[PDB]
Amino acid sequence: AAPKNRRTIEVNRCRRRNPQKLIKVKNNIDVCPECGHLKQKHVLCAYCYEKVCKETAEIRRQIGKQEGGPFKAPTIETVVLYTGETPSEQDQGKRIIERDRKRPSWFTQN
Amino acid sequence: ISHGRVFRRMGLGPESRIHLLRNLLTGLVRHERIEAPWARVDEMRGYAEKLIDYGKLGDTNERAMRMADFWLTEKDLIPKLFQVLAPRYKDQTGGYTRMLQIPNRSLDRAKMAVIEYKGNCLPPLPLPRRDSHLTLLNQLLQGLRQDLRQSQEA
Amino acid sequence: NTRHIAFSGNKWEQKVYSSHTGYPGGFRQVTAAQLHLRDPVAIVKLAIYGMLPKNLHRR
Amino acid sequence: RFLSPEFIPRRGRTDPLKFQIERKDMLERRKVLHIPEFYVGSILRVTTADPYASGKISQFLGICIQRSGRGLGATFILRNVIEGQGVEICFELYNPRVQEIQVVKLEKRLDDSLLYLRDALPEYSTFDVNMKPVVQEPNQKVPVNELKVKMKPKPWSKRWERPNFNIKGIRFDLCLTEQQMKEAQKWNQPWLEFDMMREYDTSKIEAAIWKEIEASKRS
Amino acid sequence: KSGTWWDEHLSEENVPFIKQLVSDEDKAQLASKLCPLKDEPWPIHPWEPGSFRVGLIALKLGMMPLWTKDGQKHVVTLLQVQDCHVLKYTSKENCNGKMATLSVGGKTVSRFRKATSILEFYRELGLPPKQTVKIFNITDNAAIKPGTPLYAAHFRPGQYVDVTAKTIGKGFQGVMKRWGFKGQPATHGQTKTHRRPGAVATGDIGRVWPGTKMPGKMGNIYRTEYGLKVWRINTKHNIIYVNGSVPGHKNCLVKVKDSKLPAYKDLGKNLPFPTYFPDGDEEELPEDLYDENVCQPGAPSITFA
Amino acid sequence: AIQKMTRVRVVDNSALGNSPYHRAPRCIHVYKKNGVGKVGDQILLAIKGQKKKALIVGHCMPGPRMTPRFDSNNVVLIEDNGNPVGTRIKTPIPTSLRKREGEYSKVLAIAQNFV
RNA sequence: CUCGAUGUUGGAUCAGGACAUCCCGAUGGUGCAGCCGCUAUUAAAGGUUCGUUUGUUCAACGAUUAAAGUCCUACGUGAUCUGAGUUCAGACCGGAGUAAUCCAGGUCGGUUUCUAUCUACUUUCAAAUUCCUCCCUGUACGAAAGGACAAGAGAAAUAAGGCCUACUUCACAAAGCGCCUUCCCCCGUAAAUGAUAUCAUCUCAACUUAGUAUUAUACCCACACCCACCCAAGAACAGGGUUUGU
Ligand SMILES: [K+]
Ligand SMILES: [K+]
Ligand SMILES: [K+]
Ligand SMILES: [K+]
Ligand SMILES: [Mg+2]
Ligand SMILES: [Mg+2]
Ligand SMILES: [Mg+2]
Ligand SMILES: [Mg+2]
Ligand SMILES: [Mg+2]
Ligand SMILES: [Mg+2]
Ligand SMILES: [Mg+2]
Ligand SMILES: [Mg+2]
Ligand SMILES: [Mg+2]
Ligand SMILES: [Mg+2]
Ligand SMILES: [Mg+2]
Ligand SMILES: [Mg+2]
Ligand SMILES: [Mg+2]
Ligand SMILES: [Mg+2]
Ligand SMILES: [Mg+2]
Ligand SMILES: [Mg+2]
Ligand SMILES: [Mg+2]
Ligand SMILES: [Mg+2]
Ligand SMILES: [Mg+2]
Ligand SMILES: [Mg+2]
Ligand SMILES: [Mg+2]
Ligand SMILES: [Zn+2]
């Protein structure tokens, strides 16, 4: 169905600038106590998440280098050890992933 | 009128939804931490928990072996599931997976969340933690609790 | 003393107030006596409303 | 240890207090009317009070083809061929009109539903109205009859060959062709048996129900 | 300006402590109101013709079959009274209506998820907040002091009641489901018209009459069923077995009041007035009342003769 | 249960029924305002090219509990006066017809089996 | 008024309105004994069926009902639908014409577009109509045949509003073929006393009664916890719960 008449700029403004169509102010933005960057209360910090993802990607690359082939999932647990670290009694019998860097402070060796 | 519809409609059909959940579950079993859209990463959390339950039931159980063979597209993960994943949670009676919302995806601006199996060797994710007990409100509540305990024990 | 008004002649039975609720079959006509019984301040109000100018100041 | 099927609530969003009270009423009725143990396939004779009847007492004997309903109002359907006319009657377990329920023969079939006996031959649905009650020795497993019936020529009341019904007591190899079997093997859903979330535990609920039944027996 | 919730700033130690405190306080407040006749009761006038008493707010647990002594089956609905108390009284002059009104509360809810005004209103009365508050028009002689609890014994078997509740909302629905329109045939050439309204009006008027049936929201309004018989009263769990179905889904709060039908009029002479007081009652009622014609589970099998 | 164009089976030993014919008995009127016939209702049948009245003594549609459900739409041919055409009903009929026996006494008398 | 386009016959869906009323309601007369009828006044709240052949509107027929009402609404309604008919291009039969072609002629086939800008509207929230059965009663009435009304009880159908205990489609739920509830009136006349007109007279005389509802009542009604999660709530929004925020 074709329009009967052209709609005026006044009506167009009334439709477009209605408070429903306006962007609302978000009040859930907070400050990450660790990295100091902005974050939402229900969402993880992007900075910390990216850091953890980079470290996990490096660890997975090392795991794949150790495995050296597809369809090769070890039957034992896995422990990641950094420079200047020796295998522990818990680490005994578990595949060791060696990282050529100092252990991060946030990556507490639990 | 969708009342009491626990399972939502995703994929090209019921079989497509099952296959997508199976692929996500296989990736989760392999890498122990995967990020995915919130609805898709939430739908298969119960499937992952029940898969761990079957692993606890054991490899000698024919039904458990059938379920693992179905839900694990890569056959190298079945020994993993029956040998390391289940004994890891042997003590726990449930809650083997953590799901946390992450910032939305860059391209489609989709609601994304990361799911992981507890006790993984990967670096820990940042977690939502409550305020310390040394804050003003917590100290006031602790004093109130001490006073109430004194009154009760009096 | 709007309840004690007096109508000349047989207006209590002849005069009809009509209205429409807007819905089909919602056309209601009542006599002056019925309207007075239902609302004792309606006849004078309607007369004043009719006599006032038909503009936005009437309200 | 047999728990009656109606003593298991259906999965939903109902307050367990209603189930508890309904079970209390069910047990208080069971103490008056001894409801026996039977399955889908067992032969039952039900004697009920009925107005406008010869002696006000009506007895019907037949095979149990369906049990459905939870709590008060659970029903079982008895089918029997009388004078060449098949008659199916739906009896409520806890209806006070019921005077007596007797298990003439206790057995089980290969299927949880015997609704295909409507389309099966009358010989598999014909039972003697006056048959002596068989003897089931105590502390014995319930026998599982493996009688694969022969069906009438198609069409049937329902497409029994499709996997959704999943019937294992019909001579499909005799009543159907290879092409028909292949066509029926098109609605099959292999993922349905592996959908883990579509499962009901019933273990804890059954244990609690057994505890409440034991308490009712004590009191 | 930041959004806040009760447990946002609480620590792991203080999270269960506040919950325990509020639960214990609610239990104590509920227990303290069990002696209305021992805590300054209002005068108890006898029943008189043309007198209306207060009603109840109940929870729809579900439905159950029942059998009568005439060999008939009736489906009943179980309505459970949960934490029902009188909250507010308004005089006839201040009601801005025709008769005095009394406020009745329903299911108990958390104090955290409520407004400040509601919390400070309930603090004066010393009761946990109620999920739903309803208003009952009662006569002056049926006045009840606020804070008095109410139980399912307020209604007795052999009484017809009215039940008001919000029905199961079905959302935006088409004409065929909403109003029962026949629709159009599914074959014989029909083109993209199977469930459409069709013609909405005539061409002469040039408009659509108000009240014309069109697709829209359906199923979520207040509906009242009139004349449901009370077959059975369970005084242990405070449950009323009401004849027939009632509006609303399971686990919903409904209003139960005396029937306004002219047939069931002035039948409250034998009913308790203004309400049932278990504390003042000396002869405790039996667990189940079972009316007269209801076949009790312990009764022998019925033999027609 | 039984409505217009429904092919029914005549169960009494009447001469008009139980006879060979190319067409089958068929209901053409149910004598009910709702248009649906149940047990104990009179219907009109076009049998052997003739119009006759019949009483419904059984239908395949499930009904109330504690009531029989037959595998065929069994009817008994009667007349306008209320008398049956046949003299024997070997097929069992529900006992619920004994409430209507005030107007079907002869039909229930010629009947032999009550299920 | 429109040929710089105002789309039609019949049908489907939706109905709005008038009474010149088919039934149900209330009255007068009868060539009104009762039952059936005929006629006149008032009443539009409620309802007024399913099939066979025909494109049919209509008519004919078979079976029911209380009834299967008459019309207006752009011959209501094709930016909701249909295309059997009418009314293009093909073809046949009868007739007219030398022929091309033509017929109130007949017959087969023959493309039905549109994403809604504006007006209007999108829960007129809740008092219901009718048939049948028993009794009245084989009574009143009537020579007989025949045969009520009022009152009471019960059981149904339709319509409106809800629900899933049982059956069924099926199974965390949605539905009917299933179950529950459904309450006021409607004004034509019939009659006392009584003047103008010392009788009498129901009264556009004063006045009493059948005789009436301020349609009664019911429902709705507290609101900066709301970041987040769940929901029997829902298109978004909104709403309910979180004392169920690892
Ligand atoms: K024109
Ligand atoms: K023009
Ligand atoms: K306009
Ligand atoms: K005169
Ligand atoms: Mg999609
Ligand atoms: Mg079928
Ligand atoms: Mg809903
Ligand atoms: Mg249709
Ligand atoms: Mg098209
Ligand atoms: Mg289509
Ligand atoms: Mg013929
Ligand atoms: Mg133009
Ligand atoms: Mg109309
Ligand atoms: Mg008229
Ligand atoms: Mg037209
Ligand atoms: Mg069109
Ligand atoms: Mg149009
Ligand atoms: Mg055509
Ligand atoms: Mg020619
Ligand atoms: Mg044609
Ligand atoms: Mg063609
Ligand atoms: Mg459109
Ligand atoms: Mg009568
Ligand atoms: Mg006189
Ligand atoms: Mg005089
Ligand atoms: Zn951070």
For β-strands D75-82 and C16-20, DSSP reports them as unpaired
**Side chain identity at A40, as an amino acid letter?**
Q
Protein residues within 5 Å, CB atom, of ion ligand 26: A 32, 34-35, 45, 47-48
Q: What is the three-state SS of A28-72?
A: CEEECCCCCCEEECCCCCHHHHHHHHHHHHHHHHHHHHHHCCCCC
Nucleotide showing the shortest C1' distance to residue E165 CA: G219
Length of chain A (residues): 110
Give E 2-41 residues with CB within 8 A of chain A.
2-3
Chain E partners within 8 Å of C24 (Cβ): 209, 211
The span from the CA of D88 to the CA of D77, in Å, is: 6
**Closest residue in chain C to residue E210, using alpha carbons only:** C23
Rounded to the nearest angstrom, the distance between the alpha carbon of E261 and the centre of ligand 4 is 50
Other CB atoms within a 10 A radius of the CB of residue C38 amount to 9
| Alpha helices (runs of H) in chain E, residue ranges in sequence order | 14-32, 116-125, 175-179
The span from the CA of B52 to the CA of B91, in Å, is: 12
Asked whether the beta carbons of residue B76 and residue A107 sit closer than 8 angstroms, the reply is: no
Chain B partners within 8 Å of A72 (Cβ): 76
The span from the CA of A93 to the CA of A96, in Å, is: 9
For β-strands E160-166 and E222-234, DSSP reports them as antiparallel
Asked whether the beta carbons of residue D52 and residue F65 sit closer than 8 angstroms, the reply is: no
Q: What is the CA radius of gyration of chain A?
A: 27
Answer whether E209 touches C (CB < 8 Å).
yes
The span from the CA of E74 to the CA of E230, in Å, is: 12
The number of helices, as runs of H, and strands, as runs of E, in chain E is 3, 11
- Residue F39's nearest CA partner among F18, F61, F24, F17 is F61
Structure-block tokens of residue E305: 């003769």
Chain D partners within 8 Å of E73 (Cβ): 95
How would DSSP label each residue in B31-87?
HSEEEEEHHHHHHTHHHHHHHHHHHHH-TT-HHHHHHHHHH-SSTTHHHHIIIIIHH
Asked whether the beta carbons of residue F91 and residue D95 sit closer than 8 angstroms, the reply is: no
**Are the C-beta atoms of F68 and F57 separated by less than 8 Å?**
no
Q: Give me the phi and psi of D47, to 5 degrees please.
A: -110, 125
| Alpha helices (runs of H) in chain D, residue ranges in sequence order | 16-30, 172-175, 178-184, 203-218
Answer whether B51 touches D (CB < 8 Å).
yes
The span from the CA of E100 to the CA of E80, in Å, is: 27
**Which residues sit opposite E242 in a β-bridge?**
E77, E230
Give the list of residues 6+ apart from residue D191 with CB closer than 8 angstroms, or none: B14, B15, B18
**Are the C-beta atoms of E88 and E145 separated by less than 8 Å?**
no
Q: Does A32 show up as a binding residue in the annotation?
A: yes
Structure-block tokens of residue D69: 């309903």
The span from the CA of F71 to the CA of F61, in Å, is: 9
Q: Give me the phi and psi of D218, to 5 degrees please.
A: -60, -45
Domain ranges of chain B: 10-120
Sign of CA dihedral F91, F95, F100, F102: positive
C13: left (phi over 0), alpha (psi -120 to 50) or beta: alpha
Distance (Å) from the alpha carbon of F37 to chain D's nearest alpha carbon:
19
Range(s) of the domain holding residue F17: 1-115
Rounded to the nearest angstrom, the distance between the alpha carbon of C9 and the centre of ligand 24 is 30
Give B 85-104 residues with CB within 8 A of chain D.
none
- Residue D16's nearest CA partner among D214, D205, D217, D218 is D205
The span from the CA of E235 to the CA of D131, in Å, is: 48
Answer whether E204 touches C (CB < 8 Å).
no
Domain at B10-120: CATH code? 3.90.1030.10
- 3-class DSSP state of E147: coil
Asked whether the beta carbons of residue E11 and residue B1 sit closer than 8 angstroms, the reply is: no
Domain ranges of chain D: 1-217
Give the list of residues 6+ apart from residue B2 with CB closer than 8 angstroms, or none: none
**Are the C-beta atoms of B57 and B113 separated by less than 8 Å?**
no
The span from the CA of D179 to the CA of D172, in Å, is: 12
Instruction: Say what angle helices B45-57 and B62-71 make with each other, to 10 degrees.
Output: 140
The span from the CA of E196 to the CA of E186, in Å, is: 12
Rounded to the nearest angstrom, the distance between the alpha carbon of B13 and the centre of ligand 5 is 9
**Closest residue in chain C to residue E212, using alpha carbons only:** C23
**Are the C-beta atoms of D101 and D37 separated by less than 8 Å?**
no
Torsion of Cα atoms, B12 then B17 then B19 then B25, to 10°: 150
Measured CA D138 to C1' G136 distance, in angstroms? 66
The span from the CA of A15 to the CA of A7, in Å, is: 11
For β-strands A78-81 and A95-98, DSSP reports them as parallel
The span from the CA of F76 to the CA of F52, in Å, is: 11
Domain ranges of chain A: 27-108
HSE (CB half, 13 Å, CA atoms) of F8? 37
HSE (CB half, 13 Å, CA atoms) of F101? 16
**Side chain identity at E1, as an amino acid letter?**
K
The span from the CA of F1 to the CA of A17, in Å, is: 62
Measured CA E246 to C1' G97 distance, in angstroms? 85
- Residue D184's nearest CA partner among D168, D158, D149, D160 is D160
The span from the CA of E108 to the CA of E252, in Å, is: 13
Measured CA C34 to C1' G192 distance, in angstroms? 29
- Residue D65's nearest CA partner among D112, D127, D106, D105 is D112
- Return positions of chain G under 7 A from a protein CB: 12-17, 45, 50, 62-64, 73-74, 76-83, 113-127, 156-158, 160-168, 170-175, 177, 179-184, 213-215, 217-235, 240-243, 245-246
Chain E partners within 8 Å of C23 (Cβ): 209-211
Sign of CA dihedral B120, B125, B128, B134: positive
Sign of CA dihedral E216, E218, E223, E225: positive
Sign of CA dihedral E88, E93, E96, E98: positive
Give the list of residues 6+ apart from residue E92 with CB closer than 8 angstroms, or none: E98, E99, E100, E140
Chains F, C in contact, 3 or more Cβ pairs below 8 Å: no
**Side chain identity at A49, as an amino acid letter?**
Y
Rounded to the nearest angstrom, the distance between the alpha carbon of E205 and the centre of ligand 12 is 23
The span from the CA of B65 to the CA of D189, in Å, is: 20
The span from the CA of D19 to the CA of D25, in Å, is: 10
**Which method resolved this structure?**
cryo-EM
**Are the C-beta atoms of A17 and A11 separated by less than 8 Å?**
no
CB pairs under 8 A between A and B: 64
